[PDB]
Design a protein around this ligand. Sequence first.
Ligand code: NA
Lengths: 383, 394
Amino acid sequence: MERAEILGVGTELLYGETLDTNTAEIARSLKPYALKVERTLRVADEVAPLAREVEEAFARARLVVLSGGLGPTPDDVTREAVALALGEPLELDEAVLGEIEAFFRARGRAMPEANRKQAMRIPSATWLKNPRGTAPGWWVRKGGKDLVLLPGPPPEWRPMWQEVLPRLGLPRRPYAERVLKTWGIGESEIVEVEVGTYPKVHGVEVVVRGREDRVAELAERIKKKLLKEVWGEGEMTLAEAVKRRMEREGATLSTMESLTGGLLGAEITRVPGASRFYLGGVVSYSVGAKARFGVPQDLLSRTVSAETARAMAEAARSLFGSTYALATTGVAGPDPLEGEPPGTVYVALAGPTGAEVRRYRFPGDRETVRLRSVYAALALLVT
Amino acid sequence: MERAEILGVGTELLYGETLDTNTAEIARSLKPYALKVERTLRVADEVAPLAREVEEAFARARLVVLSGGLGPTPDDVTREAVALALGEPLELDEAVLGEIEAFFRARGRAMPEANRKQAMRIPSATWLKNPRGTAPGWWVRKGGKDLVLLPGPPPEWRPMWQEVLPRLGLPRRPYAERVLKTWGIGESEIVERLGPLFVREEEVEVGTYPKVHGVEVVVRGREDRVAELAERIKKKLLKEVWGEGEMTLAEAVKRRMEREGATLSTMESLTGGLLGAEITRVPGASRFYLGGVVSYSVGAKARFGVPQDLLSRTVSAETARAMAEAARSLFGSTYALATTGVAGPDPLEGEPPGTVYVALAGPTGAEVRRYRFPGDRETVRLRSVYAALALLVT
Ligand code: NA
């Protein structure tokens, strides 16, 4: 089996100032292909060491993928390092220049001198169009091997890489993964090709991976064994599950939040099409705010309670006129509140036939508790 | 300046099934020493590729550090690979084999035969004690070079590494670094402004890192060069620098509210509550943040004060101003932030994705800033959050 070599470029990656997920993510995209990944690299922003690593990686590999260092500054030196590794001169493409120029003009700017170098390429390189940035990528086909240069930011490289990957003509292998996403059941209970369990803030994922035939058969048997706990598969998320229920019913949604601070509204609206059902929300972070939008005076001294969660959901529902409304209240941490520890949370749903509350006691730090709270609220609608 | 190579062993680190933070953490620990980290590797659990990588890393470096693959599984092959790469045989340390039996004996169990592996060392290796797990590591000194094998789990390796590092005899170099966080200025403009201040040399280097929260500028290297150079750069970037070091925008906004005795509220469209979420990330937000509304539908925009004539152009500077002034009046806060715009993937009101207006209303009036952010939907949302926060700290 031939090798794929994957290099992330950036000194800040070495030190984990920015965490290298790009190389990992590209390696994962390569599993359906019959290439071996023996190693991945993160390389500092220096021309000579980078050219050496690129030269060596290309020498031993069917495929080399580089990610990062395509910006306009003196620390972006990937194009120079690759040209040096392949013994080709860099040459300015006037058509690409016009396009960078147009990119800046739309934004009401003139094109800075330093961006000119992003329109440079070696003669062996075909351009990869960057739909979201000024630096197009490269695709070098040479001696039966492929070298691909990609931008560092994921919104640029993801669409680029999806487009070019099939075109590389790599040998395929029948690998697959199936992800079953559950809620409200611990790892231990679940236990009662390879099958793994993965605890996340949105619930425990059951992952089945390996030979596509065996993945297919096995995954069906497991989903059956976990039929009521499974809320979605693959790319499905709780927010998207909510959106599907809302559109099915022609229903609307609104929210009132305290400890989640607006994170619940943020997670609902993350999904395209949220405007078809989501009317809006209130972040009632102070006592004054809670009263002003409908929570009864009698409850304002006991905010960490089932009664308050219920009252907040009712108040949001009457304020927005939505079919359904979700509310969050409780203790995110680090401090206790009203004698209750961090991770003490009540989520509530108000709908046509009344309200329901669930209490949770969530482990984790402040941000973790906020996240688990957001997903517990969405789970009221889809579990 | 001599090289330090750092290898993380484990096939799952490649695919990010376990996030590799060990190599970066080892790399940071090397900062006070005059060694160059040109690269770090993650290597699969396979003896021949690993031996090759170790062999190459050791030939080019003053120091090689390996992390992981010291267990009892067939997939734990680091000891072998190193023995192979360095041209020395694996030798069984009887005592160590004892210590390992004691580990299992203190748990009610007899030692599995698999764990026998863990008592092999090469002649060049002296042991590094692991009182917190099964496998001890190695310190190998050879040809004036050092090679170290560390266990994978951090509670195990951190103490070990902390004890052996000051014994390696590495050249020392007084190190400093300075991180400047800017907003409202692109990388190309920073390059032009800094000119020859954008030094990249062996003694000291300047780097720029574009983030959703603005361009970060880092100066690192020799302590005596870093202070002065960083200061000159700060001077050139003065009005655009909002924080240093560990500082975050949300923390910066918290400092200004506490300093003034002032309160804050928000009104959000495209960000959907993400601005309030970011503000309340910081412990102690309730001392100043009164709350906010997410006016996602047209009906909710009108309910919370957006003028009816503006509802055909919610993506505009006039609307942003109106939103910020409405939240201010509605919550009685000293300040209010607003966001309005087009997240993507579709246009809205004829305006393309990335079109964003953020506004701030306060005691002396209101102001609005306009942006055309590239990125996907989640990116534009995030940029808008930080753009709104930057209004209060410029
Ligand atoms: Na880049």
